[PDB]
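Risk register update: the risk of archive-format incompatibility is retired. Evidence:
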Amino acid sequence: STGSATTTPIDSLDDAYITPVQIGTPAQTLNLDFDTGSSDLWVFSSETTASEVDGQTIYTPSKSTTAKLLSGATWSISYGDGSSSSGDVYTDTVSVGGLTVTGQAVESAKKVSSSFTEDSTIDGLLGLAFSTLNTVSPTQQKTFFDNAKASLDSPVFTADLGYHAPGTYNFGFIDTTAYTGSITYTAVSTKQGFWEWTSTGYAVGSGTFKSTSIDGIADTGTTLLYLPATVVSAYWAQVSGAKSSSSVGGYVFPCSATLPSFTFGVGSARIVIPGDYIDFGPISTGSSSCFGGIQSSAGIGINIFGDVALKAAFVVFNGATTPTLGFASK
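Archived output:
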């Protein structure tokens, strides 16, 4: 089998991407944030504290003839941005772009933190990291991809995120029309539960390529590109007036600037992020200070190839017995 679904930016900045997902019988369609940096499929629901729902579409298990309470199971997750959610668990039928999994753990939120409430466009998350990170207790549950894998034509999914435009998540096949050149594959460590790999270096604008190993994660659920402070300083030093602002929380730059590109290495191959992809707009409405799309990972503990980087590439998440990642230009 295969599946194919369009993923759409939630706003004019590509702050995140939502993909429609069918849950239950009859189908309830919710718009979920596909997150290769986590491993829980959780949704706003009829059980979510009413004051914490503000415009999201909710899953109502009582209206699904295929929903079953997973007795005794609870979940609770905290994300790198400080947000969190928790609740109980049902199993139900879940379909993405025509690909159906029966018995998928659907984690129903009883509580969500303020940032989820305040974002009316995201109805939940669909985790696509390794199932070892799933938070369901006392019986850990498998991701949608893990449950579907055996049925897929090939044990892969691909992320093709757009810049200020829709893109595509495919399951089970690699669309050879969706990229240019060849796909370069690179090793993955699953030891932290992530799609963790090692970039071979970087360049800023038309500058020379610096060969240096940068370990990080391919994370569709993180907006920006988070890299070591040395790399980030080298980038922003090429933008007149750019500076790191502790009050704003990262590098800002004059909105009048033209940003240089940023290249990252995948083995001997190179992915070029155009400068425009690094512009996240005014820090506050009407400001002439703009927020940068490349930020330091120094306070995180891991480098993160978020949407800023991934949207410049066609990315293969290869879930073969030994997982690997593939990147192609497009």
